[PDB]
Design a protein around this ligand. Structure first.
Ligand SMILES: O=c1ccn([C@@H]2O[C@H](COP(=O)(O)OP(=O)(O)O)[C@@H](O)[C@H]2O)c(=O)[nH]1
Ligand SMILES: O=c1ccn([C@@H]2O[C@H](COP(=O)(O)OP(=O)(O)O)[C@@H](O)[C@H]2O)c(=O)[nH]1
Ligand SMILES: [Pt+2]
Ligand SMILES: [Pt+2]
Lengths: 239, 239
């Protein structure tokens, strides 16, 4: 079992660093694999590998894996389904941070789990996926991605077309919102109805969906992201 | 089995009339019970009973039932759980309209079903409920409503505190969004991402949540509500 994340552009390296460190703080008991695609230049990989070295120990390994891009690079995320040297992968977008240990995600007995999106709430968001690799399933996702249109133009829209009955699936396959709390909801409800956000408990993974990404630019949640990233620099360089 | 709706103020009579007529157009094969509470004056009841008379036939009965208010009138909706001369009730808010026959809602074998809210998407909205009356459950809702706080100040927040594990329940108890398509989502996504709304298919019940209510005041969905209400006047008075 492993955590995985993904970087397909140099610019997202800071998101990966914030995420890596948040997993270190949470003391996750499972290794992490960082997938990087062709468009990520080698210096950025080396910089990221250096950043991560002080968090390596006998009890937690961070490893790196080159993966090829998948165009429509928008589908590069599909590679997790081919990572079949692992029985189970918990995948987290690089624009997310872990606030609390989520090791219990690996106790779900299902081949595919995801949390609801906000729009519409009976579809899932592809930023947090608990999957069991299956190279045959991977081959079918590759094929069907030349046939199925996505309602949001990206991997979330595609994966919902490939799994249109996710809302009907068992509770193991449907993660509570606190495992993928998208800031878009906070943006929309904080000024008027802050109680809607406070009802998301426990809040374990904060997802910084939509744009700009916090490293591309000061709301309360963005402040929380900068708290985590800058602490990660102190601990990497000075710890 | 019956459809039920609720009016607790004179001002909502137009919402009830739009809803009644939309159920007539959809040719629902189950009778409708309109609950009215103390605050609704008798003339408004008589006017509503007159409005509904041309839709009475040997094959569809609309009936009226006086119910007492339940304060915190915000909980008056809880009366559906005491309507135990019916095995099953499909409850619909008066600020909703039915676009397509929903008779299949009565085929769900569950005691309680509801559709997700948008905020957060793992809680349910109380505007469309498929329930099995149970006077004992009703007594407990009455009692627990003097103990449990609601995160939205109303019946939706209360019912989610009373049923906190709804998201984990089986598919029978979790209605697709198209059974309670709240216009708040359309308001929010139409200008930027209209494809999010178009992905809600089939769209069978349109819910005009938030304020103003369309009869209290011209977007595309409000135009759709006025199309239904004014047609209902023509058919009532002239048909
Ligand atoms: O320019 C990009 C776009 C995407 N990604 C990777 O693909 C994931 C999904 O894209 P993104 O999170 O930006 O989309 P959103 O969540 O806003 O829909 C990101 O988190 C990264 O892991 C990336 O590395 N660089
Ligand atoms: O002033 C009111 C408020 C509520 N209701 C009834 O209670 C339901 C729930 O209230 P509402 O739909 O206005 O709330 P919202 O959907 O905006 O949260 C309404 O649809 C009506 O059936 C009513 O008749 N008059
Ligand atoms: Pt993301
Ligand atoms: Pt409503």
């Amino acid at each position: 079992a492993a955590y995985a994340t993904l970087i397909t552009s140099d610019a997202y390296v800071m998101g990966v660093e914030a995420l890596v460190y948040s997993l270190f703080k949470a003391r996750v008991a499972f290794p992490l694999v960082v997938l990087h695609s062709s468009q990520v230049t080698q210096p950025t990989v080396a910089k990221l590998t250096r950043f991560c070295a002080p968090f390596q120990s006998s009890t937690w390994r961070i490893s790196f894996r080159s993966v090829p891009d998948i165009g429509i690079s928008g589908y590069t995320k599909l590679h997790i389904f081919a990572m079949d040297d692992f029985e189970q992968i918990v995948y987290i977008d690089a624009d997310a941070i872990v606030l609390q240990n989520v090791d219990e995600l690996f106790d779900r007995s299902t081949s595919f789990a995801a949390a609801p999106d906000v729009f519409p709430p009976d579809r899932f968001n592809a930023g947090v996926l608990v999957i069991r690799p299956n190279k045959q399933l991977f081959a079918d996702l590759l094929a069907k991605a030349k046939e199925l249109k996505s309602y949001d133009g990206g991997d979330t829209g595609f994966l919902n077309a490939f799994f249109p009955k996710w809302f009907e699936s068992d509770a193991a396959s449907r993660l509570p919102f606190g495992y993928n709390a998208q800031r878009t909801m906070y943006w929309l409800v904080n000024g008027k109805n802050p109680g809607y956000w406070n009802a998301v408990q426990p809040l374990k993974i904060l997802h910084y969906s939509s744009n700009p990404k916090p490293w591309e630019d000061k709301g309360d949640l963005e402040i929380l992201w900068w708290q985590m990233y800058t602490e990660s620099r102190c601990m990497s360089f000075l710890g």
